[PDB]
Design a protein around this ligand. Sequence first.
Ligand code: SAH
Ligand code: ZN
Ligand code: ZN
Ligand code: ZN
Ligand code: ZN
Lengths: 261, 8
Amino acid sequence: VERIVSRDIARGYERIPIPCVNAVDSEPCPSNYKYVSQNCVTSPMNIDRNITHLQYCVCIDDCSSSNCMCGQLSMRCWYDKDGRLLPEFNMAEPPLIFECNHACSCWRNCRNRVVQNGLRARLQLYRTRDMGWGVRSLQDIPPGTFVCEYVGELISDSEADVREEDSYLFDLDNKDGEVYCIDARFYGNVSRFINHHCEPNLVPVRVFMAHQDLRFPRIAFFSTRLIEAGEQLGFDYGERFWDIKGKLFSCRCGSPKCRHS
Amino acid sequence: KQTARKST
Ligand SMILES: Nc1ncnc2c1ncn2[C@@H]1O[C@H](CSCC[C@H](N)C(=O)O)[C@@H](O)[C@H]1O
Ligand SMILES: [Zn+2]
Ligand SMILES: [Zn+2]
Ligand SMILES: [Zn+2]
Ligand SMILES: [Zn+2]
């Protein structure tokens, strides 16, 4: 039967609690990592935070017009009045999103600000039957909604390559060269617990907010369809995960269209 | 790579 093993895994760092429950076994709330709500570093990363390097808009409205320069950078502003991605948004090949920033002329409540407002969906960490811990939604999530950010320790591609515990690494760029990675193993938020699914209800999108250093996008998960209350969250970890892990275990997502079973 | 990486 269900036991609530934590009131809030985030210790009050998010806008709402993220409880943890276990209806499967005797395990308490996972505690072998440090919950952080924003990315951190160990070794320095030298993100370009020169305020004069920001591209910004000069909008006199709420940034919902054709003329918003931040929208232009994003191709167009993809957010509707409710903060959801427009039906036209390419989920198969997402564009980079540039949200408004502190250099823009607009107000803090303009249209082009969603990820920077943080996690607001009611989520729950729970014990799955056969994939360890997972994350579910406690309420219906309409399509195109921002759900959570992949947060953790920002490291180099080189450093990521010597991290023995590799289950929580997320590459920020797929190219060769100077590339960075978020490791959610030691420091991470709720997204570290999101399991892989071959027909996923989340898609990761690269987003820029307070800085526009292209080496360091932030990773935001948006829903790809209506997620019903109770449903487990999942995204496609991608081939660079399964190329390594597929030699060790098979995918248990359960999709008829599973590509890693 | 030597380690598993999630990616877009
Ligand atoms: N679709 C899937 N099939 C089998 N194992 C999965 C899976 N998705 C995630 N996992 C497991 O979870 C790891 C990613 S970390 C995700 C959270 C994890 N379930 C935990 O309890 O900490 C993978 O290496 C694998 O061990
Ligand atoms: Zn604007
Ligand atoms: Zn702007
Ligand atoms: Zn704006
Ligand atoms: Zn699968």
